[PDB]
Amino acid sequence: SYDIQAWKKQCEELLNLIFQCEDSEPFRQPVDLLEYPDYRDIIDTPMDFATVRETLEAGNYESPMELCKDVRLIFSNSKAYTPSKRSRIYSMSLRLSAFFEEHISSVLSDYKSALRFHKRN
Ligand SMILES: CCc1nncn1CCNC(=O)N1CCN(C(=O)c2ccc(C)s2)CC1
């Protein structure tokens, strides 16, 4: 299955599933700097799932590896900002990360396989 472009719709469908997950609710929009006034002293690069979806739809990802780096940044930002391991929003991030990693693994493998096939000769 050597379609070099297939990752994009695969990533659109996975973002749809993430938006249906109740665990995604805190990550569907950029963090509110009014409620978390110290957020940007800790977090150098804010990221959220609406920004990832807009970047994809604008044609501003070249590969699913780039999309994966931004999604992983959502989760590392949560882990760095959490005042506790036993916090609600952080705990939701860990379940959502497990779900995302379970689903992205085939998208990445198929893409890298397709690119190797394109440069086989
Ligand atoms: C637009 C407002 C809105 N309306 N519905 C949801 N959101 C969420 C917006 N994002 C946000 O405000 N968040 C707080 C920071 N955060 C964290 O990862 C944290 C880690 C542990 C903590 C104690 S907070 C990410 C979620």
Swiss-Prot record:
Subcellular localization, as worded in the UniProt entry: Nucleus
Tissues in which the UniProt entry reports expression: Expressed in myeloma and epidermoid carcinoma cell lines.
Modified residues (Phosphoserine): S1, S91
Domain Bromo: 2-107
Chain positions with Phosphothreonine modification: T45
Entry superkingdom: Eukaryota
Function: Probable regulator of the insulin and insulin-like growth factor signaling pathways. Stimulates cell proliferation through regulation of cyclin transcription and has an anti-apoptotic activity through AKT1 phosphorylation and activation. Plays a role in the regulation of cell morphology and cytoskeletal organization.
Quaternary state and interactors: Interacts with IRS1 and IRS2. Interacts (via bromo domain) with acetylated lysine residues on histone H1.4, histone H3 and H4 (in vitro).
Disease: Chung-Jansen syndrome: An autosomal dominant disorder characterized by developmental delay, intellectual disability, autistic features, anxiety, hypotonia, obesity, and dysmorphic features.
Protein name: PH-interacting protein
Naturally occurring in which organism (per UniProt): Homo sapiens (Human)
Full-sequence range covered: 1315 to 1435 of 1821
